[PDB]
């Protein structure tokens, strides 16, 4: 109720545990849908109408969908349970306990950290943004423009020409 973004950040790490651990590309692939979809909420809450939905269009509805092909093209091995495997369950339990132990330290405000920066509370200070702009508002409200950054458009177009030509030549 008090926090909005902080709850979603825990689920973000929760989906990421199946990457340090090895639960096969089927169940490991499922993690990017869970961590990605919840990961949009972390971006969207501070703002960014266009940039928040780009994860749904490219990272979720493009990137991992192509990865859906490759799992069937190479190493399918009929999907298996990720609990019976040795060391996989050990890597999963140690992966969560590195983050869930820090969750217990969030209570009573201050938490111990490996980094020098302190966490404190930051609930109302989590956003740390005033109203300021009104009409055509937000820095991410006009996120992308072809003007000013003319050089960036040329090289991105050049790099995407390379990809089509190269991958066709390999096969």
């Amino acid at each position: 109720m008090l926090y909005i973004v902080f709850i979603l950040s825990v689920i973000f790490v929760m989906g990421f545990v199946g990457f340090s651990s090895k639960p096969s590309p089927i169940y490991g692939g499922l993690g990017l849908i869970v961590s990605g979809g919840v990961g949009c909420g972390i971006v969207l809450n501070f703002g960014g109408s266009f940039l928040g939905l780009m994860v749904f269009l490219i990272y979720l509805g493009g990137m991992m969908v192509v990865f859906g092909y490759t799992t069937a093209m190479a190493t399918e091995q009929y999907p298996e349970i990720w609990l019976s495997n040795k060391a996989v369950l050990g890597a999963f339990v140690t992966g969560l306990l590195m983050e869930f132990f820090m969750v217990y330290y969030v209570l009573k405000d201050k938490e111990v950290e490996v980094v020098f920066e302190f966490n404190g509370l930051g609930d109302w200070v989590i956003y740390d943004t005033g109203d300021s702009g009104f009409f055509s508002e937000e820095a991410m409200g006009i996120a992308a423009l072809y003007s000013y950054g003319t050089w960036l458009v040329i090289v991105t177009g050049w790099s995407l020409l390379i990809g089509v030509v190269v991958i066709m030549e390999i096969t």
Partner: peptide, 28 residues
């Protein structure tokens, strides 16, 4: 500050995931 503390921890898990290998190549 506060939100950055969790996603930096999420970054380290994904970093180790690149450096870890057991049989499969698709995980990388």
């Amino acid at each position: 500050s506060m939100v950055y503390m969790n996603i930096m921890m999420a970054f380290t898990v994904s970093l180790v995931g690149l450096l870890m290998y057991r049989s499969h190549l698709m995980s990388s």
